[model samples]
Target: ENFRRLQAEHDRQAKELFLLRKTLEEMELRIETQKQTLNARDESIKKLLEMLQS
Candidate 1:
């Protein structure tokens, strides 16, 4: 009986870990995408400013 309870708890923890990992992966991807977007916008602004000066 004790063994069964331990097994159940282990399984529950495994599932929780899996979910946490998935959430982390998604958040990391989103952060990377936003960074890329901001970088692109900065580059565009720089180009526009150079054009305006010229």
Candidate 2:
């Protein structure tokens, strides 16, 4: 009985770790996409400022 309980606990922990890893992967992708959008916007802003100065 004790061995069964330990096995069950280990299984639960393993499942939780898998889910956490998947969540981290999704968040990383989102961060990369957001970074690209910000970079584009920054370039546009800089061009507008140059136009204003000229």
Candidate 3:
């Protein structure tokens, strides 16, 4: 029936949406990790500069 076809389409779309959301979550986590790494590098650079000046 037409109703069953529509129901199948809806389920397919819902599954795709769920996968997209998971990908977004993983990307966000990677971004956060990179930010932390950059911050640490920045601090290290500052310390080295201070040492050079002394």
Candidate 4:
């Protein structure tokens, strides 16, 4: 009976770990998209400043 309980606990923890990894993967993808957006805005600002200087 004790062995069976231990097995059940291990299985529960394993499933929780899998779900956590999936969430982390999705968050990383969002961070990458935001970085690209920030870079584009910065480049546009620099171009506008150059026009004003001339």
The candidate scoring highest on TM-score is: 2
Quick one: RMSD of model 4? 1.0
lDDT of 4 by residue, 1-54 (tens): 999999999999999999999999999999999999999999999999999999
Deviation from native of the Cα of residue 24 in model 1, angstroms: 1.4
What are the clash counts of all predictions, listed in order?
0, 0, 0, 0
Candidate 2 residue lDDT tens string, 1-54: 999999999999999999999999999999999999999999999999999998
Better of 3 and 4 by TM-score: 3
Screening candidate 2 with a backbone cut-off below 3 angstroms (N, C-alpha, C), the clashing residue pairs are none
Ranked by lDDT, the better of candidates 1 and 4 is 1
Residue-level lDDT of model 3, residues 9-47, one tens digit each, is: 999999999999999999999999999999999999999
Model 4 C-alpha lDDT versus the unseen true structure: 0.98
lDDT for each candidate structure: 0.99, 0.99, 1.00, 0.98
Candidate 3 residue runs with Cα over 4 Å from true position: none
Per-model TM values vs. the true structure: 0.81, 0.93, 0.89, 0.86
Candidate 1 lands at a TM-score of 0.81
- Give the candidate order by descending TM-score: 2, 3, 4, 1
lDDT score, candidate 1, position 52: 100
RMSD of each: 1.3, 0.7, 0.9, 1.0
TM-score of 3: 0.89
